[PDB]
């Protein structure tokens, strides 16, 4: 087991230190090195971020070249 993808993505963002937020890359490398996830985790981490951004719980920032960064809305 592991918690829900959303709960693993909030643990992954709470551990980041930055004047931006976490990248989808940062969040897949944290979750894969700390929980017992399977081979479809890539897919599952993108799907929950798409959902968590729509529900209002993640916020995002985009720049030029800046591929996408995620912070917890409060």
UniProtKB/Swiss-Prot annotation:
SS bonds (residue pairs): none
Subcellular localization(s) per the UniProt record: Nucleus; Chromosome
PTM sites of type Phosphoserine: 6
Reported tissue expression: Erythroid cells.
Organism domain of life: Eukaryota
Boundaries of every H15 domain copy: 1-74
Residue intervals passing through the bilayer: none
Physiological role: Histone H5 performs the same function as H1, being necessary for the condensation of nucleosome chains into higher order structures, and replaces histone H1 in certain cells.
Protein family: Belongs to the histone H1/H5 family.
Name this protein carries in UniProt: Histone H5
Organism lineage: Eukaryota, Metazoa, Chordata, Craniata, Vertebrata
Full-sequence portion shown in this chain: 25 to 98 of 190
């Amino acid at each position: 087991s592991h918690p829900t993808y959303s709960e693993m993505i909030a643990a992954a963002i709470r551990a980041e230190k930055s004047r931006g937020g976490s990248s989808r890359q940062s969040i897949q490398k944290y979750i894969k090195s700390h929980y017992k996830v399977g081979h479809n985790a890539d897919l599952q981490i993108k799907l929950s971020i798409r959902r968590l951004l729509a529900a209002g719980v993640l916020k995002q920032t985009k720049g030029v070249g800046a591929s996408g960064s995620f912070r917890l809305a409060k």
